[PDB]
């Protein structure tokens, strides 16, 4: 189409957030107003300030868990590696799979990761032992295990770090240095659990009159990005488009390192508009920084309005919300979280509510404010959404996204095709059947030609192999429960693991090859369908941590 | 309400009404006093936390 040669596309997502196993669950959580903080009743004898010192936590179950063997890692070695690195490693694998791609097949990829300094090394016994887990090891470990050639490095701007990754990818993919770019962010801390910005009750009530602070969180996620034109031509699955992103720093205008400044925020926002030229009236929803501070939240809108106002403004047409309300403030993954939420809303053309809001902050002036606070689901009938992240440092980010609009879905021309399912361990293969299994029914009609297509390509050939040659979803499905149901030799199935004819071997398509795949080296690429987001490799649940 | 033994009655109605470096000067007539003063401010600070030093 038009301004697509200057844009990026989000073609893959993988994430884990409080109360979210995956990006799909995540969305459905926010859409329905679910809040993922957690509270304790019966578990030190300090029942005092809050035990603000912080009475409730926002938690990621299984931050320790890992599947080290997948990557050729000693168990001893995992215990030395940071949890944030491990998580970003699994997610980077996952995100590319959700894209439908095999890393190895897209060497031309850039990697930008960011994570916190949790001083993880500090919990190891006293150690010979070389310090190289550094921040740099994270992106670089990932490039090495996925076989990526793109420039690979680590970026951090505190709260703004993910948008910094997003910025790098935007420049990088435009500059032709890389065909694909991979951006991820994580925070996992290494602990148990006035004069600050801590919330009184542990509720981030963003845009509420009684907003008195914020609460901490843990999360990790990654997305895969492609040039937009390429994505359509190449036929990838696109959630959303990234039009532009901007970065800058406050300078020494405001009084203090921790002070957010009106003028500084305004400029990124202005700066980005000029870059994309996008007209504010164009914008349906804005995901604000939305920390929940008395003074931070007046400033954001103040800045937003001041920019928006000079434009063909006047109204109250734009939705403004913060997902921090649901999850908390994830220092380094704050940008990632907002980003995924906005990408999902555009994907589904719905607006997620912002919870913990009863009244409007008098200071906001929302009424002159071109944008109304979110409190309900939305109807949307492309649309553009914006995202803000402002660093503790004084580094500010703003970004805009565009809906991706056209599907002309077609029925299945051919009545049978072949799934090739595989895993690095049999236990894994079974769950994969389960995870897949659950999905089919959950998504009631999904094409398998593409489901077939995406597993044929975009999933690697693991040793344990199970290949299915069905024709009908229920048909496939139960036969799956047939495989899951372990030793009934019923199905049109083919056990996997259970020689090289590498040399110059022609192969003719037309028939059942599953056997040949079942212990073989077949290249399913003749017939074609579109790549699609299905379930991804189920990693084992081994926990590793330092005693 | 308050009504006296005398036969004098009274009634009343009330209504509900809605930096980085500080200096605190503390003084007393005597040194224990000034010291007792210190326990109490200390004790006060413990209990009430979101209490502004400014």
From TrEMBL, chain B:
Compartment(s) of residence: Cytoplasm
Family (UniProt): Belongs to the ATP-dependent AMP-binding enzyme family.
What function is annotated for this protein?
A: Involved in some intermediate steps for the synthesis of the antibiotic polyketide bacillaene which is involved in secondary metabolism.
The name under which this protein is listed is NRPS/PKS protein
- Origin organism is Bacillus amyloliquefaciens
Taxon lineage: Bacteria, Bacillati, Bacillota, Bacilli, Bacillales
Q: Which residues of the full protein are shown?
A: 2161 to 2222 of 4982
């Amino acid at each position: 189409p038009d301004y697509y040669e200057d844009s990026l596309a989000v073609i893959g997502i993988s994430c884990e957030f409080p109360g979210a196993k995956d990006h799909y669950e995540f969305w459905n959580n926010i859409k329905e107003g679910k809040e993922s903080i957690t509270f304790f009743s019966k578990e030190s004898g300090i029942s005092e300030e809050l035990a603000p010192g912080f009475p409730a936590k926002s938690v990621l179950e299984g931050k320790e868990m890992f599947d080290p063997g997948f990557f050729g890692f000693s168990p001893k070695d995992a215990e030395y590696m940071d949890p944030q690195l491990r998580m970003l490693l699994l997610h980077s694998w996952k995100a590319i799979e959700d894209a439908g791609y095999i890393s190895k097949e897209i060497p031309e990829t850039s990697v930008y990761m960011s994570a916190s300094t949790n001083s993880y090394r500090s919990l190891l016994p006293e150690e010979v032992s070389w310090v190289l887990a550094q921040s740099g090891t994270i992106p670089t470990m990932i490039s090495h295990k996925l076989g990526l050639k793109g420039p690979s490095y680590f970026v951090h701007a505190n709260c703004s770090s993910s948008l910094i990754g997003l910025h790098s990818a935007f420049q990088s993919l435009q500059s032709g240095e890389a065909k694909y770019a991979l951006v991820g962010g994580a925070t996992l801390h290494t602990e148990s659990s006035p004069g600050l910005n801590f919330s009184s009750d542990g509720h981030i009530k963003a845009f509420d009159a009684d907003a008195d602070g914020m609460i901490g969180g843990e999360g990790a996620g990654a997305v895969l990005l492609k040039k937009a034109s390429d994505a359509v031509k190449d036929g990838d699955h696109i959630y959303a488009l990234l039009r532009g992103i901007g970065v800058n720093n406050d300078g020494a205008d405001k009084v203090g390192f921790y002070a957010p400044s009106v003028k500084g925020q305004a400029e990124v926002i202005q700066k980005v508009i000029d870059q994309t030229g996008i007209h504010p009236e164009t914008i349906a929803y804005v995901e604000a920084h939305g920390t929940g501070t008395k003074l931070g939240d007046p400033i954001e809108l103040s800045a937003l309005q001041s920019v928006y106002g000079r434009y063909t403004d006047k109204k109250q047409y734009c939705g403004i919300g913060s997902v921090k309300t649901n999850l908390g403030h994830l220092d380094t993954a704050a940008g990632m979280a907002g980003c995924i939420k906005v990408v999902m809303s555009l994907y589904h053309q719905e607006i997620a509510p912002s919870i913990n809001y009863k009244e409007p902050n008098p200071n906001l002036h929302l009424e002159d404010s071109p944008f109304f606070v979110a409190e309900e689901k939305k109807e949307l009938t492309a649309h553009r959404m914006a995202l803000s992240s402002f660093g503790l440092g004084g580094t500010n980010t703003h970004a805009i996204f565009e809906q991706y609009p056209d599907a002309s879905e077609a029925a299945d021309a051919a009545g049978p095709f072949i799934i090739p399912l595989s895993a690095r361990k049999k236990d894994r293969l079974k769950e994969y059947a389960k995870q897949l299994l659950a999905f089919l029914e959950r998504k009631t009609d999904t094409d398998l030609a593409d489901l077939a297509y995406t597993f044929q390509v975009g999933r690697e050939a693991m040793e344990e192999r199970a290949a299915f040659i069905t024709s009908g979803t229920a048909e496939l499905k139960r036969q799956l429960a047939d495989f899951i149901n372990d030793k009934p030799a019923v199905t049109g199935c083919f056990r996997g693991e259970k020689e090289l004819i590498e040399k110059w071997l022609a192969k003719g398509k037309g028939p059942k090859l599953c056997e040949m795949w079942s212990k073989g080296v077949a290249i399913n690429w003749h017939k074609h369908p579109k790549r699609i987001s299905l379930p991804v490799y189920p990693f084992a649940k081994e926990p590793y941590w330092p005693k």
